Structures are given as structure tokens and as C-alpha cells.
């Protein structure tokens, strides 16, 4: 039994917290939609 | 069908003890978009208030309610993006980041290297124009525990 | 049950057993029309079927995997509807398909009238390959039912 | 929870009663999956 309720508008913050890496990853995608790494 | 105004939505369940947030979603143009592994294609409530699934695909790990997929924006493969994170019991939160790349055999996919608690799936990835370019929740974890979610987008 | 073939979609929700529709099993994937199951889980007696793919406009839904059936009517040959009526033995009904003309193209259609619970029954080409599903169509001027040959994309 | 049970082998039967016409209709499909005429 699931339900939904609003959590906020969808809009860009013009001066938000900037972080995060940008990794180039060799990955795969199975029949069940799961990603896995390739070495 | 309840409140279908545009914006981000939490996906809640009462199947466990405490009211748990098992996912996030974006309502746009009358359609509720979210990850497949969140709802597993099951119908959703919205007050009273019900939404039937319209289209789904496990491999893409996406699903739409009350209509076809509406999110058509895409990452330019150059700019930074903001993850509108909606964690369980926590307020909506924007986190700006430069996406990596999931190098697959069938083209390459953008990827945000950000980790969040289980239940944040379906959070929309945004560009500097306010458009939804994909959803958060399906990806991998690397050598370090950190989560690298793909920028999962369907097609309008 | 994982064996290929045509299956009945049942529920004990009603007075007794009630056939809500028909489906086909092929390559580990169960195919049926969307209006039949509404995209819900399907018990296989000793097994469970999870939804994989579906589309309301196409009125199709596959289970345990992607849509496998991709055979198509050639536009000339005769076809056979494998009707699985509620409580009746399955039977082959042979006919020449009619045509649905849309703004996106032409679809094959069969002029065979059959009750609710038969929707999802296979429509086979000369080699027995499934080229579409029965159950989704129109009602003409007279009050008679015409169904399309609904095929999905693999 | 709806359940499934087998009905038979998906095959062609050489001995089958032929019936039904072959109409050619201009139809329209809405977003709700319902067919309609023009």
C-alpha cells in the first residue's frame, strides 16, 4: 500500500552547494536493469 | 487522482512499522515519473486518489503513471547538474555536481557520484534551466563505498 | 510453471473461478493484454510472475522479461485465432484478417466475436508464430465487435 | 492475486472452422488505449 505527497517544486538553485566527482566508469547493464563494473 | 500539480513527490509505504519513504518522484504534465524498483509497477495512492501505471520497463528501471513519459531533457555532457535530493524524513535538497560517464557497450550514460540513504530513488536530476534530465537511484558503488547513480532518463 | 504455451488468466476473487483473460508463454516470458491484468503480479500455482514491461496505449504487458513476440502478419496469408474461452476448450479459428487504418499506419484485424476473458488469446500465422493478441478493438455500426491484431516490439 | 493456468499448445490446426469477414476500417487510437472510428 503506497501513496504520494508533494515534497517541493522543481527548480534550479542559482547558488547551491557545489560538490561531487565526475568518474568515467566502464559499466554494464543486465536484463534486470542493474549496473555492474567492468575491469 | 489527487494533487497532480507539477513538482517533486515522496513515495511512502505503510507496509512497515514507521511510515517509510521508499522513493521519490516527479509529477509533470499530469504524469508521475519514478524508478521501477521503487513501486515495482504497483499502483499508487494520492488521497482518494489512485494512480494506475501507464508504461514500465525493468531494464530501464523507470515507470510512469496516468500517462506516457514526459521527461525529454538531457544532460549536455558538459555542464554541472543539481540533484534535487528528497531523503526520508528530510527536506528537499539541491546538490550541484558535474556528472561522470557510464561507459557502456551501447553508448555512454551520465552519472552523479553522490550517496544518499535507501529511499531517495526517483529524485530528479536538473540542469541550469530547471528541466528534469533524469532520475536518481540506479547505479553502482565503487572501490570506496560512495554511490555513483546513473542519470536515468526515458524518452518522450 | 515456466513451460511455453497458451495460459488462462484466473482469479478466485469472484463467486468462484473467473477467467479475466488469456496469455501466452514464450522463452520464459508471459505475454498478455494490459486491460486483463492491469499490470499486476500473477501466481503460477507454485510460481510468481513479476511485471517487466507494459504500455496502456498498446494495451500490452509482458512478465519475467521483455516482449519476445515479434512475428507479424504478411498482409496476405490467412491466420488462426487460438481462442481460449472461459470454461471452454481451446480451439483454432481460421480467418483472413481485416485492416485497421490509423494515422500511424495499418494494423491487421480479425472479425471474430468472442466474450470477455478471451482477450489475450494468440493469433498465429501459418507457422504457428504469434503475430498478435486478441481482445482490443472497436464496435462497428451494427453492434458487432471487431478486434485488432495487437503485436509488440522486441 | 490473479493466477495463471495452462490452456494448451500454441499450434496451427489444419482442421479448423473458417468464419468472420474481412473489413477495412479507418480507426483512431487514443492515449487511453481505446480504439475508435473516424
Amino acid at each position: 500500500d503506497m501513496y504520494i505527497e508533494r515534497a517541493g517544486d522543481i527548480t534550479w538553485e542559482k547558488d547551491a552547494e557545489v560538490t561531487g566527482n565526475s568518474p568515467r566508469l566502464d559499466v554494464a547493464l543486465d536484463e534486470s536493469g542493474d549496473f555492474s563494473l567492468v575491469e | 487522482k489527487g494533487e497532480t500539480t507539477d513538482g517533486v513527490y515522496r513515495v511512502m509505504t505503510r507496509r512497515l512499522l514507521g511510515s517509510t519513504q521508499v522513493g521519490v518522484g516527479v509529477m509533470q504534465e499530469g504524469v508521475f515519473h519514478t524508478m521501477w524498483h521503487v513501486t515495482k509497477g504497483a499502483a499508487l495512492r494520492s488521497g482518494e486518489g489512485r494512480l494506475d501505471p501507464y508504461w514500465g520497463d525493468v531494464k530501464q528501471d523507470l515507470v510512469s503513471y496516468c500517462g506516457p513519459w514526459k521527461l525529454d531533457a538531457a544532460w549536455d555532457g558538459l555542464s554541472e547538474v543539481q540533484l534535487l535530493a528528497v531523503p526520508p524524513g528530510e527536506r528537499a535538497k539541491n546538490i550541484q555536481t558535474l556528472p561522470g560517464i557510464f561507459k557502456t557497450k551501447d553508448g555512454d550514460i551520465g552519472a552523479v557520484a553522490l550517496d544518499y540513504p535507501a529511499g531517495t530513488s526517483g529524485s530528479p536530476i536538473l540542469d541550469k534551466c530547471g528541466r528534469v534530465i533524469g532520475l536518481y537511484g540506479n547505479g553502482v558503488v565503487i572501490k570506496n563505498g560512495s554511490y555513483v547513480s546513473a542519470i536515468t532518463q526515458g524518452k518522450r
Side-chain angles (χ1 to χ4, degrees), chain A residues 2-38, chain B residues 2-127 129-142 144-154 156:
Chain A
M2 293 182 176
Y3 63 93
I4 66 175
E5 37 204 23
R6 201 151 186 264
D9 301 9
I10 297 190
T11 167
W12 173 276
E13 184 179 354
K14 299 185 286 292
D15 208 84
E17 172 185 351
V18 187
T19 175
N21 294 331
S22 308
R24 300 170 164 183
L25 296 177
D26 276 342
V27 308
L29 185 63
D30 70 333
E31 191 183 285
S32 300
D34 280 311
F35 290 104
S36 66
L37 289 315
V38 181
Chain B
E3 185 196 26
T4 50
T5 184
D6 284 23
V8 79
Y9 286 74
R10 305 177 186 265
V11 178
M12 305 289 299
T13 185
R14 303 190 191 268
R15 195 57 56 171
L16 273 73
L17 189 48
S19 297
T20 316
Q21 177 178 327
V22 290
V24 195
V26 175
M27 187 85 66
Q28 184 175 315
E29 310 178 39
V31 176
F32 185 68
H33 315 75
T34 185
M35 313 295 287
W36 179 272
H37 68 267
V38 173
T39 69
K40 296 268 84 175
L44 303 173
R45 201 190 326 155
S46 185
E48 273 168 355
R50 183 191 161 148
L51 317 182
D52 271 89
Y54 188 92
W55 162 83
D57 187 86
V58 166
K59 194 170 186 178
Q60 300 184 30
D61 197 33
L62 294 177
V63 65
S64 64
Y65 288 76
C66 301
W69 197 263
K70 302 282 187 174
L71 317 179
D72 43 337
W75 179 53
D76 52 20
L78 295 163
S79 308
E80 287 194 341
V81 304
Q82 278 177 8
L83 166 57
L84 217 174
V86 188
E90 296 179 355
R91 200 167 297 103
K93 198 146 49 189
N94 282 31
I95 304 295
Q96 187 157 341
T97 177
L98 182 68
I101 278 183
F102 275 180
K103 293 169 292 166
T104 71
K105 68 192 207 67
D106 295 309
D108 310 283
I109 316 176
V112 285
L114 297 171
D115 199 321
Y116 272 92
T120 326
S121 269
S123 295
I125 318 292
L126 305 185
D127 51 26
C129 286
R131 307 181 295 242
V132 180
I133 64 178
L135 297 184
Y136 171 90
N138 189 26
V140 289
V141 293
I142 50 189
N144 147 24
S146 65
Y147 194 58
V148 186
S149 174
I151 308 184
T152 306
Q153 177 72 298
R156 188 188 184 97

